[PDB]
């Protein structure tokens, strides 16, 4: 009980960096998909007003 755990504090910082590294990559992929949808359908709108 006089071990208010340092290995828990070092376990937190590792599992937090493992989670942050995964989520910072997944945010960048999900913004790439979402930006690709915006740019593609803005390009479709310009194509389609140019067809009307």
């Amino acid at each position: 009980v006089s071990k208010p755990d340092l290995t828990a504090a070092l376990r937190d910082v590792r599992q937090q960096y493992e989670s942050v590294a995964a989520k910072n990559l997944q945010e960048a992929e999900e913004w790439y998909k979402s930006k690709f949808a915006d740019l593609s359908e803005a390009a479709n709108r310009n194509n389609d007003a140019l067809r009307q």
Partner: protein, 52 residues
């Protein structure tokens, strides 16, 4: 741009394999703490189990 987002996604996934390598350094530290917790459990129940 959508073909370049298929490529940027493969390299963002190659970066998430490095974010997970740096999380895996912390996970392998917890796995060494589990391999050490085994030796602490082995040592403490041996203090409880006792001579003639």
């Amino acid at each position: 741009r959508l073909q370049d987002e298929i490529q940027n996604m493969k390299e963002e996934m190659a970066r998430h394999l490095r974010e997970y390598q740096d999380l895996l350094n912390v996970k392998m530290a917890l796995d060494i703490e589990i391999a050490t917790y085994r030796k602490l459990l082995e040592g403490e129940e041996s203090r409880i189990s006792l001579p003639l």
